[PDB]
From Swiss-Prot, chain B:
EC number: 2.7.11.34
Protein's name in the database: Serine/threonine-protein kinase Nek7
Organism: Homo sapiens (Human)
Function: Protein kinase which plays an important role in mitotic cell cycle progression. Required for microtubule nucleation activity of the centrosome, robust mitotic spindle formation and cytokinesis. Phosphorylates EML4 at 'Ser-146', promoting its dissociation from microtubules during mitosis which is required for efficient chromosome congression. Phosphorylates RPS6KB1. Acts as an essential activator of the NLRP3 inflammasome assembly independently of its kinase activity.
Gene label: NEK7
Effect of R112E: Decreased interaction with NLRP3
Chain residues that bind ATP: I21, G22, R23, G24, Q25, F26, S27, E28, V29, K44
Comment on protein domains: Displays an autoinhibited conformation: Tyr-78 side chain points into the active site, interacts with the activation loop, and blocks the alphaC helix. The autoinhibitory conformation is released upon binding with NEK9. The NTE (N-terminal extension) motif is a structural component of the catalytic domain and thus contributes to activity.
Region of interest (NTE motif), residue spans: 1-14
Cofactor field: Mg(2+)
Effect on the protein upon substituting Q110R: Decreased interaction with NLRP3
Outcome of mutating N71 to R/K: Strongly reduced protein kinase activity
Oligomeric form and interacting partners: Monomer. Interacts with NEK9; interaction takes place during mitosis; it relieves NEK7 autoinhibition and prevents interaction with NLRP3. Interacts with ANKS3; this interaction alters the subcellular distribution of NEK7 by preventing its nuclear translocation. Interacts (via N-terminus) with NLRP3 (via LRR repeat domain); the interaction is required for the formation of the complex NLRP3:PYCARD, oligomerization of PYCARD and activation of CASP1.
Annotated consequence of substituting R136E: Strongly reduced protein kinase activity
Enzyme class at the top of the EC tree: transferase
């Protein structure tokens, strides 16, 4: 099909698909380049007709409409969404950045810890991102190290694809997932708490080895995680983690509060 | 006009107009509130059926469709555009805090120069915004301190109050020759704005300023040189190449962004 510059990012003719890089319940994801400007992008084809009922389709369209309105230094961009060839086509940023997963297993090999000062540098940006998202009534739904990208310069980008430009049972299970299959805005806070623990501890709070799913549910119920070392990490980091990893969603702080703490701690640690 | 959550940001019903904040040749801008999320927005109403012929209507629609694709932290986001009550309605990111115009005046009244460190801190963000617009083949057409918003956190938001892009603050040579507006016309504006950040006045400003003297000063690019004691050769040379009568010899925004990024990294 022939180029149509008037359409910009809103037609498949302006993209060359490279390879499939992902399959989901409802979607396939590709690496593509825009033909107008040569920018590498992720192209998510969602079967809103062939794989969803009417309720799923409408809710998914509403959600993508909100996501492509976000405009924040620390969020992976949704560049476009349009219907063509009977699918919802979503064009997303692939960032020139490593995922926090990679950085974590790096420090692990080198038997070193991320100093509290760097942790706050990264965590304040994630919190800035999530505050932006919750202010437009958008839940993230999969906060994990694989979805957090860090640039050359140390700017954080939160995505939901787990795919950078160059390198690539949900990861942190909440009590409300275990018990009621529920996910709300406070479920993002739970995950954010677990990610702050993982940056300091270099492993998930509910990690273990053998690990029955049943043992993993028992530990989550009791919030039974190894305490962080009080010699390496302030009481205010360890407390923020404890407030976030709370079995009751209602008792977890809102992201405004977590962002405010991250901002005070960035300020007094830099 | 009563609520409809299903219709989203795409009908006037889900918005309360709170006051006018802008007026252009073909448009009014309002501060408004989304009743679905309590988020405050700007609402531009464009008179595509009363002040416009078919050509201008079709051009203005094509442009709005390209503008709503822009997505950059330093560019005012366009959330939605729809036709309702016989206008083209646009729902935009509101930047209701300050702007470069208010900052420049603040420094002017305090009889203080803006430190070069601070100039690059704001200027690299404006360059970032414009590199994004140009990469998508979108001209700004109305670059001036008042259209450069600044959030509480000090994030630059490049906007356009009253779509002055369809119609200046910075008389360019390609206005004096009537010649019309292109990508390198944005670069002229950009160089004048950098100058004004360092001098606290437009490069062609005068007390008893009048069209004759202005046309002469643009013809010769006659602006008071910046104090070499306060502002680097790099900053002065970057102003110098942008303020050039020939659009084809002005640098492209990628080059200006690259210098700004490198000058920012150095002075911090």
């Amino acid at each position: 099909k022939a180029l149509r510059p008037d359409m910009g990012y809103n037609t498949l003719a302006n993209f060359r698909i490279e390879k499939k890089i992902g399959r989901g319940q409802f979607s396939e994801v590709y690496r593509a380049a825009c033909l107008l400007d040569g920018v590498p992008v992720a192209l998510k084809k969602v079967q809103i007709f062939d794989l969803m009922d009417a309720k799923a389709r409408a809710d998914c369209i509403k959600e993508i409409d909100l996501l492509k309105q976000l405009n924040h230094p620390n969020v992976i961009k949704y560049y476009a969404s349009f219907i063509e060839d009977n699918e919802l086509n979503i064009v997303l940023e692939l960032a020139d950045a490593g995922d926090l997963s990679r950085m974590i297993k790096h420090f692990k090999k080198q038997k070193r810890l991320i100093p509290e000062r760097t942790v706050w540098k990264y965590f304040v940006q994630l919190c800035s991102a999530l505050e932006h998202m919750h202010s437009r009534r958008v839940m993230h739904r999969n906060i994990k190290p694989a979805n957090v990208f860090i640039t050359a310069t140390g700017v954080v980008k939160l995505g939901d694809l787990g795919l950078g430009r160059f390198f690539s049972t949900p990861y942190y299970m909440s009590p409300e997932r275990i018990h009621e299959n529920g996910y709300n805005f406070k479920s993002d806070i739970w995950s954010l708490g677990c990610l702050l623990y993982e940056m300091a501890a270099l492993q998930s709070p509910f990690y273990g080895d053998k690990m029955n799913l049943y043992s993993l549910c028992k530990k989550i119920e009791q919030c039974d995680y190894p305490p962080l070392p009080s010699d390496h990490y302030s009481e205010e980091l360890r407390q923020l983690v404890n407030m976030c990893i709370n079995p009751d969603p209602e008792k977890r702080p809102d992201v405004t509060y977590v962002y405010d703490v991250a901002k005070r701690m960035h300020a007094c640690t830099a």
